[PDB]
């Protein structure tokens, strides 16, 4: 249905350890396509997906150039925040930015994002209207007034509505052969005893894309989500994902429990059982 373009910035101040570190990673949907690390000795935005090697040098020095001047702007912002929050140089601080766009079957903009964080907490976010700001504390409220006076939201709304969605389309065509490809999960179920009268049944989902999946357990046609351990959806390491859901059942009753795997990669939601 939807497709997303997002960039993730991380600024970390390293006190006495030199100038601060700047990282930029870009994602299309659930696939990472670009990367930048100020520490890395390349001094360049680098492709993190094979379909990106299609782009020429003109694309990358541009992409390096912006990410370099952004590293500078974020170097100043680190000091500014330190001033707002009355912090000392001794401590290491982190500011985050995530921005990007969702698009619908139209190709037109579905939604747009531009948010910031300081030391792991909301700082400032652009609202869904793309014309107003949500500032977490009163230090963020300062930035908000400046930003309103500077007309930042118009500039952002313009990048999001225009530039963001064009390149999203463009990246989608470049990586069409995998980004629009759907990977169904590999589903097995496993048994591991706990006690002389209890066992753990585990529903596996292997090598699927995208990351959105649903692993439900039920007994006799009625789900028991109260008695279910379930991991975070993790990376398989090759681009795809894996997740599992477990349930403590009596060692006497195994067939009475059925797992239900739901994924966009599958034509029909499939069910598994211990054999």
């Amino acid at each position: 249905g939807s497709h997303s373009l997002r960039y993730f910035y991380t600024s970390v101040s390293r006190p006495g350890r030199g100038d601060p570190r700047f990282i930029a990673v870009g994602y299309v949907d659930d696939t990472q396509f670009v990367r930048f690390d100020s520490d890395a000795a390349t001094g360049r935005m680098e492709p993190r997906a094979p379909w990106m090697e299609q782009e020429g040098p003109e694309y990358w020095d541009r992409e390096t150039r912006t990410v370099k001047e952004t590293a500078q702007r974020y170097r100043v912002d680190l000091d500014t925040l330190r001033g707002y929050y009355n912090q000392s140089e001794a401590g290491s601080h982190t500011r985050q930015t995530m921005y990007g766009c969702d698009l619908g079957p139209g190709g037109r903009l579905l939604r747009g994002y531009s948010q910031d964080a300081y030391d792991g907490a909301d700082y400032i976010a652009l609202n869904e209207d793309l014309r107003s700001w949500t500032a977490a504390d009163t230090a963020a409220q300062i930035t908000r007034r400046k930003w309103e006076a500077a007309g930042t939201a118009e500039h952002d709304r313009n990048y999001l509505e225009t530039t963001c969605v064009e390149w999203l389309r463009r990246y989608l065509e470049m990586g069409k052969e995998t980004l629009l490809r759907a990977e169904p999960p590999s589903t097995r179920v496993t048994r591991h005893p706990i006690s002389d009268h209890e066992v753990t049944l585990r529903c596996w989902a292997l090598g699927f894309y995208p990351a959105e999946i649903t692993l439900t357990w039920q007994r006799d046609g009625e789900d028991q989500t109260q008695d279910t351990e379930v991991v975070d959806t993790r990376p398989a390491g090759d681009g795809t994902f894996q997740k599992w859901a477990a349930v403590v059942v009596p060692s006497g009753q195994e067939q009475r429990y059925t797992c239900h795997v739901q994924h966009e990669g599958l034509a029909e939601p499939v069910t598994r059982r211990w054999e």
């Binding site: 930029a24 541009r62 912006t66 974020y74 400046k146 930003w147 500077a150 930042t152 990048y159």
Partner: peptide, 9 residues
């Protein structure tokens, strides 16, 4: 394409 400009805090 990454946004060319960011507004300082």
């Amino acid at each position: 394409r990454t946004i060319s400009y960011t507004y300082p805090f």
